[PDB]
RNA sequence: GAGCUGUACGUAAGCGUUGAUCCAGAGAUUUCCGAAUGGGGGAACCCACUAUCUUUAGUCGGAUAGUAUCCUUACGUGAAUACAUAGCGUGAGGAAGGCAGACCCAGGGAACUGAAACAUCUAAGUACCUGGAGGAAGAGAAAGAAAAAUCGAUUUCCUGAGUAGCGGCGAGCGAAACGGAAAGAGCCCAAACCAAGAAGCUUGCUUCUUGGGGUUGUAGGACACUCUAUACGGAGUUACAAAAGAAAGUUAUAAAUGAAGCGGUCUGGAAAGGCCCGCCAAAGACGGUAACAGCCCGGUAGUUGAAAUGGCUUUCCCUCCAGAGUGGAUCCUGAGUACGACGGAACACGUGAAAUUCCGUCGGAAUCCGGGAGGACCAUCUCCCAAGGCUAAAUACUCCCUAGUGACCGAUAGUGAACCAGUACCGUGAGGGAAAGGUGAAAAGCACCCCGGAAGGGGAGUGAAACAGUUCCUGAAACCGUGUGCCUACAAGUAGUUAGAGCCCGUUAAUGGGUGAUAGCGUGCCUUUUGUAGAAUGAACCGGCGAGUUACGAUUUGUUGCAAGGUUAA
RNA sequence: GGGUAGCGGAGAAAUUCCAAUCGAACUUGGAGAUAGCUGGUUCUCUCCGAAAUAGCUUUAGGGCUAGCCUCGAGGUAAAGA
RNA sequence: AGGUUCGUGGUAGGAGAGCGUUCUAAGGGCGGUGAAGUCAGACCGGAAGGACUGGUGGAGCGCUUAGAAGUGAGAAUGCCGGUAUGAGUAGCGAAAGAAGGGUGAGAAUCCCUUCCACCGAAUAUCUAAGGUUUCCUGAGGAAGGCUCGUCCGCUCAGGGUUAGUCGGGACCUAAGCCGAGGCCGAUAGGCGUAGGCGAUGGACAACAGGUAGAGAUUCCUGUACCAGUGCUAAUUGUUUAAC
RNA sequence: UAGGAAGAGUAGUACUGCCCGUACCGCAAACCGACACAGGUAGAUGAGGAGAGAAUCCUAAGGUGAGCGAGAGAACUCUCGU
RNA sequence: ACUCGGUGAAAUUAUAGUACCUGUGAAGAUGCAGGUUACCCGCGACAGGACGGAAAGACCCCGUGGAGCUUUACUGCAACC
């Protein structure tokens, strides 16, 4: 996907738009994202082996990728993303800033 | 280029930037059955022989390779029977089986039906069975079509034309040439002769093989002489002879890059929508994203990319090559053949005045001073040269792969099959053959409390919605219930309609709504009938599905264009 | 445990049996056989409106021509009642 | 456009004008401030039909002018699905049960005890065929069981079948079947010799006990037999030739 | 007997002996009959009294009480007795 | 069979508030006419009617329907001479 993990993101459309997260896991297979502090859902959890006492678990769901953008690590807003060669690696580079990300 | 160990959750144990999972090309491995092939067999099983090796103290056990049948061929052995053949053995090559329910060639070959009966005829050389194929098959370079003049190998399409004809002259069947197009390409033998060899001895001869020569109708060739030519030139694996090897290019099979809004605000669970502003465009295809996106994502136009393998096209290499003329002694030019009789079949043509082609059986020519055809046949003329073979393209079809399209279907439709479908199920078997799609954007799939053994509920919680709670979008009718306003236990009812009190309501507001004591009138619907309430037929009820269409011809009416003209087909 | 298969087989003979099927088994195909016969054929209104007869017919509950209906167009030395 | 006159029952049937459904094209619109569909109303048109308002629903659909049709159902002993009536009706598939204890949420129906009754050339014990896990143990009670069920040939999870001598093969053949060469025949194939398969028959070496969840001539304990092999110890024979 | 043949038997010891079936039902609720169906299904064994007997009646070993019940004791129908 | 507890079908069915007599009518009426009877809802019984249910009458006729059989019907074919 065009985003990683281990990555900033900017949250541009849904209940939580306009916040701001960290990638905790990737599932390109379906093509959704987990983002720490974003779209937070109750579990009812009957006590188990895990989580021996149970209860109303507040966690983290995944979102769409297509609702998430790139924060460059200086100019620090949503861009765009292209892919420059650069030596004996392909790196990404913010569009609107013309530097690398990476 | 960052996650991964499938559907498929989960647990467990692990692996990946020292670059995994994944994608493409090329390799290796590939149990048993099945043509099944060492022998057998009731499918996926049973039992071996011969060589070499291995284990044990030795039987017992283990590994590897070979071992079917027929055809062709080489060698060897070898009977009645003397030579020899048959037979037997070994080796080397080849075949066998399947299918794409299509297309085409051949062998065999119906009936129902139509003729308003039926036998000739039709259906129909169709269905079907069997055998051969090929990517196409078949046909194909005139013993042709023709007719005051010519054409010049096949095949397919348009016309000719529902014409000429065939026909219990009934029902019906039904051409071809000329003319216009698509596509186009021509060639090898046999025989006269030459050279060599071999067998018989046909005993100095014929007859067998090999090589050269040569293939045609104005007749051509052998044969005689002239001219040139042995690679100067020409051709080639699609016929014309056949087998290889290189290089360049292109294409197919993974991919890379790729412009422009997080714009403000309203509603909302969520904005891609409304209103107000911008921008890109060789890119406003398509799909996704919490509602309808050119500017969010995958992408799109444009421009790039291939280690490996395949295809195609050029060039090289390689390989193979006599062709003109003038003569007319002699020689050659496809024999049990062509034809004819008899019996059949194919020709549009049913025996007919029946040409032309093929099959079975009998008879049976000429050979250049020769032979065949021109729809009986003769004469004249014209055209042609059989009884040997090969040949691309234009044509037919689709089990497949790639890219797409549709005034095609939308879950009783569209494939039988949108779902683990040729499955479940039925049948001894061949065979027949279903039903069955939808939670939510996201499992956030209801912690906890209460009644109950559970199932199932009532709260609480999640969510926009739980009257979306794991047959879950919507949720009609039949059918089953609970509550209630008006009527009903002296009445004879196709159940309504017209008149009409009383009681109860209050509308799309108008000479309004529900129910109805009592009074008049009144024998369902359909089909089929001279005539049906009919004791004639059909329907338990509700829902879905369920019947004059299309192609090509004819005729008539309307409309439009042109008009003694109108109009093109392929 | 085996053999005989439908234009066939078996029959101490009854048209008897050949997988609950037999004056000619079952299955698939020709095949949507053919049916001058019975049943069915789906929305509305406006104008007109029959026949159940003659002739021929392997014809008689079928057909064909005429007669009777409907739509359109014509011509008069007006022909209809 | 307006008059005048004459008309306006209808089956088979002829002629005309229209309504509604799906799709296409253009124009012009509606719609999360709620589309289609569905429900209910006392509205409009000459008919087929068409609006308006409210509930449910939760994402698409009208209008105009043209065009094209899988174009409109009440009947076919029509096809498929759902649901009634008969009706709490017929039936519940040959037979002897009773009481006391136990278990359990729950007992005529499950377990135990006692008494009674039935079969007994069988309704007892083996074993071929056929079936194919139905066998044992622990859990269970939705569906199946013509009632009930705490039970079960039912559901779930784990188990369970031991051979030199038993039955079959590695042994034999009958009927019948296949069949190298061969004979016959439009094709396909039919018949058949050598050879080979094929028991329902022939030949062939093991008995008695024990085994408390499920196997026994198979396992174990005693005592055997059949066929072979090596190793020891004696005997004997060698090409007028042991065997 | 034709043939093959220098090894052979004897006694004792110890070792070797493959593949398939094997559970359970089997006059039956497990097989053939669409069913937990009054039908059908080869063979071996099959006790006592009385008896010719495998007839008949009552019993042994062994196996069963049959997958809807209770209570009333009308017509009528069925199977029985006088 | 009947009453009680458990379980629980089917053929059939245009909608039904479903009397009798004499008549009428497609000529034999629960439903039409004129009269005569008749409070509402059931349970156990019996079969006169609903031309009761079941099976598109096997008899009879018709169709230019079919099949099996016969012969000195017609036309053929095998086989034999
Ligand atoms: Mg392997
Ligand atoms: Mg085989
Ligand atoms: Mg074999
Ligand atoms: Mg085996
Ligand atoms: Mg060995
Ligand atoms: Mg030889
Ligand atoms: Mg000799
Ligand atoms: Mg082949
Ligand atoms: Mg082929
Ligand atoms: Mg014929
Ligand atoms: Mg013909
Ligand atoms: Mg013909
Ligand atoms: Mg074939
Ligand atoms: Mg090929
Ligand atoms: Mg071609
Ligand atoms: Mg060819
Ligand atoms: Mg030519
Ligand atoms: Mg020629
Ligand atoms: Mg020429
Ligand atoms: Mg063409
Ligand atoms: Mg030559
Ligand atoms: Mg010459
Ligand atoms: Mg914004
Ligand atoms: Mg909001
Ligand atoms: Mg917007
Ligand atoms: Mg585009
Ligand atoms: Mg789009
Ligand atoms: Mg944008
Ligand atoms: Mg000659
Ligand atoms: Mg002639
Ligand atoms: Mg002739
Ligand atoms: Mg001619
Ligand atoms: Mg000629
Ligand atoms: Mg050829
Ligand atoms: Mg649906
Ligand atoms: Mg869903
Ligand atoms: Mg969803
Ligand atoms: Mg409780
Ligand atoms: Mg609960
Ligand atoms: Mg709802
Ligand atoms: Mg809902
Ligand atoms: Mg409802
Ligand atoms: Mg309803
Ligand atoms: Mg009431
Ligand atoms: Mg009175
Ligand atoms: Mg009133
Ligand atoms: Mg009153
Ligand atoms: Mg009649
Ligand atoms: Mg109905
Ligand atoms: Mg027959
Ligand atoms: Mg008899
Ligand atoms: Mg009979
Ligand atoms: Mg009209
Ligand atoms: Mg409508
Ligand atoms: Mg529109
Ligand atoms: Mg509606
Ligand atoms: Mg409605
Ligand atoms: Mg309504
Ligand atoms: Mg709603
Ligand atoms: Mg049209
Ligand atoms: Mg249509
Ligand atoms: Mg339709
Ligand atoms: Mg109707
Ligand atoms: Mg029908
Ligand atoms: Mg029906
Ligand atoms: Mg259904
Ligand atoms: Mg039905
Ligand atoms: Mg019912
Ligand atoms: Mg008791
Ligand atoms: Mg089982
Ligand atoms: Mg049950
Ligand atoms: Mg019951
Ligand atoms: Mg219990
Ligand atoms: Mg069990
Ligand atoms: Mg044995
Ligand atoms: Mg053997
Ligand atoms: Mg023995
Ligand atoms: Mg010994
Ligand atoms: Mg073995
Ligand atoms: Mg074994
Ligand atoms: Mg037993
Ligand atoms: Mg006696
Ligand atoms: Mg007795
Ligand atoms: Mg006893
Ligand atoms: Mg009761
Ligand atoms: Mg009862
Ligand atoms: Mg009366
Ligand atoms: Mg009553
Ligand atoms: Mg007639
Ligand atoms: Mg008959």
Not at 36 to 42: A, L, R, S, T
Request: glycine share 10%.
């Amino acid at each position: 996907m065009h985003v990683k993990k281990g990555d900033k993101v900017k949250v541009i459309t849904g209940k939580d738009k306009g916040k701001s997260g960290k990638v905790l896991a990737a599932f390109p297979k379906k093509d959704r994202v987990l983002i720490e502090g974003i779209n937070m859902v109750k579990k009812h959890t009957k006590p188990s082996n895990i989580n021996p006492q149970g209860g109303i678990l507040n966690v983290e769901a995944p979102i769409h990728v297509s609702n998430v953008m790139l924060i460059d690590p200086k100019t620090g807003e949503p861009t765009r993303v292209g892919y420059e060669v650069k030596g004996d690696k392909k790196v990404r580079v913010a569009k609107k800033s013309g530097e690398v990300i990476d």
